[PDB]
Design a binder for this molecule. Sequence first.
Ligand SMILES: O=P(O)(O)O[C@@H]1[C@H](O)[C@H](O)[C@@H](OP(=O)(O)O)[C@H](OP(=O)(O)O)[C@H]1O
Lengths: 216, 1549
Amino acid sequence: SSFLHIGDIVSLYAEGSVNGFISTLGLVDDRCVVEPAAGDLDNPPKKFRDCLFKVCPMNRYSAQKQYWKAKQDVVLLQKLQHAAQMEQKQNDTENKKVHGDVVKYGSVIQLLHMKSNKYLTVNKRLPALLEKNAMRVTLDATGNEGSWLFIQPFWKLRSNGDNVVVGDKVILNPVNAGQPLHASNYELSDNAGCKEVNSVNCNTSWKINLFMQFRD
Amino acid sequence: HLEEVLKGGDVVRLFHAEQEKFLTCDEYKGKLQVFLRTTLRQSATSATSSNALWEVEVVHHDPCRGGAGHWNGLYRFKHLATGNYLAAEENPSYEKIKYCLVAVPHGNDIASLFELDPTTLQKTDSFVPRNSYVRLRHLCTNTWIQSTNVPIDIEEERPIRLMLGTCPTKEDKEAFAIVSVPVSEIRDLDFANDASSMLASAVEKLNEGFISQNDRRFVIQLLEDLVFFVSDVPNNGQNVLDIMVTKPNRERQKLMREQNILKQVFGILKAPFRPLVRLEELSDQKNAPYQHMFRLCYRVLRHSQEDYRKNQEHIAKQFGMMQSQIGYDILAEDTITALLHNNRKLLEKHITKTEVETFVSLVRKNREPRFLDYLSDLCVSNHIAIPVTQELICKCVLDPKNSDILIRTELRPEEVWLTWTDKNNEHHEKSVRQLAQEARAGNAHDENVLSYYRYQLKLFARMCLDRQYLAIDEISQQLGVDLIFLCMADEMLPFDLRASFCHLMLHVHVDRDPQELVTPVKFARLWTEIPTAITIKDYDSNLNASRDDKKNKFANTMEFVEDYLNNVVSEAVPFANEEKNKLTFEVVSLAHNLIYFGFYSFSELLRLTRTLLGIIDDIVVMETKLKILEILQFILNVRLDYRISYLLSVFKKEFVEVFPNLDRIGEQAEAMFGSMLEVDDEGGRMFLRVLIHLTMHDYAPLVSGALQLLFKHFSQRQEAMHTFKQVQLLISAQDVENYKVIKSELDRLRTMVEKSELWVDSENYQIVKGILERLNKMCGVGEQMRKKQQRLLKNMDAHKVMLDLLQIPYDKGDAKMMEILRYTHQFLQKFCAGNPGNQALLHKHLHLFLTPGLLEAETMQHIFLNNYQLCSEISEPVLQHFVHLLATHGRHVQYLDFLHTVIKAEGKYVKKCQDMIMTELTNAGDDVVVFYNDKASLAHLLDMMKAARDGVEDHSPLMYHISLVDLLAACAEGKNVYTEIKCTSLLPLEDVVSVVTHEDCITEVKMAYVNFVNHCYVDTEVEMKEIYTSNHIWTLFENFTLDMARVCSKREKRVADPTLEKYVLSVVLDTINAFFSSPFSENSTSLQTHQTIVVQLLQSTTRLLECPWLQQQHKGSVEACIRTLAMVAKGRAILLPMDLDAHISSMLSSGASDYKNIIEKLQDIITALEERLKPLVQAELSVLVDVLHWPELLFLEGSEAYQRCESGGFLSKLIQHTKDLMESEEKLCIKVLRTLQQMLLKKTKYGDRGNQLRKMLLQNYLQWSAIAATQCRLDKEGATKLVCDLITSTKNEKIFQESIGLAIHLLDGGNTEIQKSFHNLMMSDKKSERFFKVLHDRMKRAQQETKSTVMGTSVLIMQPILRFLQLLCENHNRDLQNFLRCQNNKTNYNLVCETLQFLDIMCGSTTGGLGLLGLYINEDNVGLVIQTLETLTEYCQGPCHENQTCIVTHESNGIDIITALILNDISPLCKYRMDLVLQLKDNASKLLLALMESRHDSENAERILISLRPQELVDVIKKAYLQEEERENSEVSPREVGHNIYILALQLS
Ligand SMILES: O=P(O)(O)O[C@@H]1[C@H](O)[C@H](O)[C@@H](OP(=O)(O)O)[C@H](OP(=O)(O)O)[C@H]1O
């Protein structure tokens, strides 16, 4: 028994309509999928590196978003770029300083997929490819405000402000979209046996399995 | 023995959180079973039961030793209420459960051993803290416990018992919380168990047949102990058989019910009569102890059911035996009455003709007044008459057969004689005076006769209650008005008898027809009926003439009431004798009823007011005080009406004199506002003193009434003007005729409704239908007179009559009743048509229309139609009810129409309503949101459209679908992204095009789909816009061109279709313009097919413009569409035809190149009077401030009231009651808060007349250091706690704003005493968490709204909060400065960081601070920015190193914004209001200086210099010094700002 610390490498096991780990398609694809037939908790999938995520603290993207909006006047753009770089440095320093802190229920976190080195993001302005009634979950290198995720309890024996214990089932609720991640039953045409991950109200829960710690 | 750990022998509850249920062990069928009990209570943790208590036993080697528990130890659980031990046994079936939990009798086996498993990381296996979640494992089988949904009591309604089971696999969510149990409950359970065991033994002995004397005495003692325990009253030697309880113990009642004690009581009452004792032998002294035992049992039953529905029903389940044991001296009828007097359901279910006849026979046999009292009580429940029981009792008692049980009365030559019949069938007659005299002497027979007569009168009055004509008609002849008047006027008769006579008079004669409530103020008056001169006598004569009755049959009654009140006030102490208090209350109630029915005159009302004030200066006393206050309010309303009549008479006199002035009319109006209209003879001193004394009472209704009257006393002028502004004259002859017709019809309809019961189940229906039709016709058509008719109806109060008619009871199936109801609904809808006042009046009674029904839905739609005020404030429950009706009853278009009307009103859309409706529709499912997307559904839709080709029925599935599509389009038209996404998913574009392009498609569906596409695809925030880069839109444009060609052909052939014309001229052009006026469409026009479609659109649109049939209204839209399309085509470089291009160029060049007089005079008079009297209104309102500041001067020195007022009791009581009335009277709370703010505010002046009025009123009534003293006094009284509680517990924006303002006024001047009081309250009280949380939430909401805008209530209310914080931290209060940053509580909110983030967001963030600061600081937010800067400066100063460091190193980089505020010029605002810019610069400089006061390190200096470039700083300093033109008439000189900036530069250098 141990608590969840910022910087730990963890795996998420969906236990809802479809049971399986969170995986990402190879190449430069930015789609998160769940493959129930790949493996389970007792028999993890052979390729047990695409399902590993790292917990990171909240980051500030106001200056970066403003710079992107301006880019999409030369002096203003250059100063916005400088401000964005300074904000990135400040975020890196804050991550280094907050490294090793315990994660509490109701707190905002980010999930960095290590193999692709990309933050998991949810876009509230883009419907999902298959389930048109759900929003789109993807992976972004730089990241945006959609990477924020409230780590909410799933069981009633856990309350806000309590430390997260390894092995618990939790809910990852995007701050902006406001609808928990859902492992839909839709199957991708391109890849067989894989199920989509989107953002829509459901009863899905994610079990947190510890793989490595920050001190290790 | 620590109390913070789990110890052996402790009693706890095991609460399964996942199921949210307690673990219980109960006997279901002759066997104990363990389970989880399901509760319907909202709070699952409040479902505490005595059977859920478990005892924890720690297992050690020594059986006599316990000790604190350990996580690694073994535990046993014993059922404290039964003694059984929890254990597990083999599953009989073996589902997933292998073993099922049970309750074994002995706990010496290993099957009852359990061990705990913590759910988290504990501090080693040292101790088990209480109130900690645990998991239970069965050691013997090594299995973990879990819950299941299998009901044990499956073969019953409402299963509540759920089986648990142990499985070999552990579940983490299956955890139990340990809840502590009070020692009071533990002791109560122990006592109940012991009593139940003893009663069971006694019942067993009684059933056996032989009971010893000692056993019987022990049983009697146990019953007495149970009675005392249930009553919860100390045993001080009072008789057990007669105990009065002020507050029943619900916990003890529930324990008695659930421990099977009432069952034992019933067994005791039932066993003897099966024979040890017979009901016919209970009078024997030998069987007297059994009688006492039965009486004790019945007392226990009565005490176990007081104010407890469940216990009442449980006892009523055995009603047969309780009724079979009636009559004998056991007190069974008393229990029966106590049962069926508070529960209406059981009363009507049980009390019937058989019971009434049994009571009648019993009273015939015995003639005990108690039976008549019980009969009277059975007629009324909760002070409300029950028609069924009332009619039954009346028809049984007044039956001529049972005429020997009632005492008859007669008048002889007069004097009153009473005649009765004794049990020996002997007739007796005697005079009332002789009876009373002999009773006073001591004659027991006469006293009993008088008591019997009094109870008979009480029964008659209760039967006649609520206008029971069946009994009133029979009793009136027997007891006339003259007889009752003589009896009540007689003094020798006892006060109780006089009070009974008064009550009978009130409930027999006064409460009848045609007597009805009369409105003191009438808004409609006839010009011909306004006398030139009006006085009190003339007004009284006019009221008498208006009254229908010519001869008053209650004049003697009123005279007697006046004489009695005069006698009462003559005595020094009015409320001394309790017996006389009953008579006084009855007289006051009779006077109140007569006044409200309109039998008094103005002079009589004034005399009664003086008498009642003299009387004024315990429940009966409070009730009579409330009655007196109501009478006073009615008389004040009458006085206001008289003043209005006087003003009307003055206006008429002036108008007639000048047309066969303003100063004269104003002086005449001022004259009455002082002599003869005064409430009292002391010029209001007595009235004010009485109001204050009543406010000083602890009775909440009396305090509220006194406060309301006190507030209304100092607003006579304002209220008079407000009422005079709503006066209608009805000068025209047509208006007079309509007024007469409306009056007659309303009177007839109201009489018919009042006499409803005789025709609801006949010409009455025809009369009602004719009246309704005539009223509907009279309402009129045409806005020219529709407003006049609606105002006349509002003044005549037809809406109340219509609401009463709607509320009339009826039975389903009556077509005529349905028709009249429909007519009433139509009348209400027409009445609420374009009149916001009428709409609000109807909405005030909304609860009536919250029932299923198409008529009700239409009425709601009409009420909410085109009313933004109500549409924006519509409540969530209404929408939830409408959605539930749609889901359950069916799919009806009325609900969709109501939803659309709520969404759109007065053009502007309601974002809240849109979002709420969309969310509700999404959550409802597919049963209300039906779309035809599949092949079969599309075929069905095509078939329906083909069938509806000629037209669409008003109620049809096609109409419902169209309404749903329109509603979704309206919802998506707002500013929500998920709504648009959901709409697109529900209706894919492919389905839209397939439906539209189909040859068989109605124009309504086409228009709905086109509007849906326009509002959900063309205009959206979705980054991936599917409308573009697709051929669906091009196909839709081709269909639009085909439709245009069809319209042109039809117009040429004279087959014009208005629907098609409206569609093409409304939605097609709008969609085309929206599509072609967007940047994303630039790449769309690329392909050759797209170019050809563009050319087709060009030719079609130019042909449409050329065709002359188009109206002038759409010419602008057509021209705009043509210009946009031509611009797009030219940008795309399309080879247009030569003639078409020439015509387009030509079009572009062309485009580029005496009742009226009476009303007017009345309006002018109203305006002049208001303008002249406003200062006097202000002065009169202000006088209340001094009255509340010095309330003790009204009383006389040396009195108890004077001492209480001087000691600040008045203000303390007002403050304490303000919190109590906050929930009830929000308006009164707001008024009290405003009064406190005015009292805390500085004194001012109004003018010569205002000062004269103020000084005169002060003389008549009351025969910065000051502000600080007043603030300290209010703080001592408890204003700070009041404002804190209001802020932390209120939901009303007005209340929150008033609390903030009062706090600001208290903290004004930086009062250290109030600051310390606030700090102490915050640090001590546990509500500081809530206070800071709500402040943080409000600030975050304001920040979010500001960000979205980059105005509004949230943004505006920020400034008061910032001012409050600034005053809180004023004078360098380091304690509060640090507390606002960090709190010692568990959760801390950083208000400094929140304020800095708000400032950064409002200043434009990085883009604003990099040089675009001028585009965000407008003329409205400049004050808020200045206040924020001042608050930040106050935080920084003191100095506060922590706050300075936090602001400097905050992640939001607000220091850059602060520096930009100095180094940048707000160009838009500099050339308009330069002083505000100078103030902003000065505040920024002061904040920067405060950020570095007590700092020796260079961190802050370097951080500031990073943004402050020295060259720019010097340049701005020099510019400020040079600037001198603005100094002209400037509050702040630029030179001072430049000097401050120079000082900052020196410090930074
Ligand atoms: O407010 P009311 O009308 O009295 O109704 C109460 C409550 O709503 C439930 O009916 C019942 O709780 P359960 O669902 O737990 O039976 C309770 O009984 P209780 O006194 O046994 O709690 C009642 O008193």
